[PDB]
């Protein structure tokens, strides 16, 4: 057995699967969705364990969906700040404060690919995401496959 806090502290595919069949609900339940920065953090930690394998892919996608549905459905949640901070943490947009941009964007890009196809996703964010994923950046160039896929998906939004 495992818990959400331990998973978020040191994310790994196995730790996510160890959360159980209700892992998606637990991730969203244990995240303070009233804080955009904490949602960005949870979104990146969960997506960081994405693997193109049946069980893991499903677990990450379901977690992202539960988390983002809870955050976005709050009429008070500022979706624009979420997007801005997401881009900042992904190293695609600069910020006044100092942040540690994650080293691998593969998982985050694949998670986003899934997220943008869901009903809970605010379509108004699509153009902004598209602008920064197409914008030249070394971190994106190293994840060509995930990047092209996300862009192709964004074209259909």
């Amino acid at each position: 057995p495992a818990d959400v806090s331990t998973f978020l502290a040191f994310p790994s595919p196995e730790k996510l699967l160890r959360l159980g069949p209700k892992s998606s609900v637990l991730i969203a339940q244990q995240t303070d969705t009233s804080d955009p920065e904490k949602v960005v953090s949870a979104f990146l930690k969960v997506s960081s364990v994405f693997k193109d394998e049946a069980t893991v892919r499903m677990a990450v996608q379901d977690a992202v969906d539960a988390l983002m549905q809870k955050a976005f459905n709050s009429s008070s949640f500022n979706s624009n700040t979420f997007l801005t901070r997401l881009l900042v943490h992904m190293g695609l947009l600069k910020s006044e404060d100092k942040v540690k941009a994650i080293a691998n964007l593969y998982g985050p890009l694949m998670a986003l690919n899934h997220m943008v196809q869901q009903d809970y996703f605010p379509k108004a964010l699509a153009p902004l995401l598209l602008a920064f994923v197409t914008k030249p950046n070394s971190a994106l160039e190293s994840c060509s496959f995930a990047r092209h896929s996300l862009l192709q998906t964004l074209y259909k939004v």
Binding site: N80, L83, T84, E96, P127, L128, L130, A131, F132
Partner: protein
Amino acid sequence: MSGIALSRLAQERKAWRKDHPFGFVAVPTKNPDGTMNLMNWECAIPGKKGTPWEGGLFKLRMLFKDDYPSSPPKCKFEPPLFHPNVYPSGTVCLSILEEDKDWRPAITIKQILLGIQELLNEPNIQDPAQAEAYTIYCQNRVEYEKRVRAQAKKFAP
């Protein structure tokens, strides 16, 4: 221990009052006791004629740190402006305003204000400070200019 900054700022003020570009404003704020606060200036930059920013007067605050002029002043538009290089907070980005970039102790307030004015119609699209203005500028230039004109008219003296 801001005596060095204060000495320089007193001279910057006399220089500016002696001669500055027409339409521009740069004046130190007042402390509660009525004395001048040379570390906090209220400025205004006029849109450049011939550009969609024409007719507008854009106010900004210039804050100097105790170690000035070793460090550049922080410039923030109040209220925040729709522009690719202006943070949502209002902070304006410019190479000459970055200590590890082009800032040099000698740079003057006049240079900074003219630099910011030039930046208005000639944004640095390679390094945006906000997602909103950048996205629009890149996806629909006509729409971007339309928003710029509306903002200029909104901030007309």
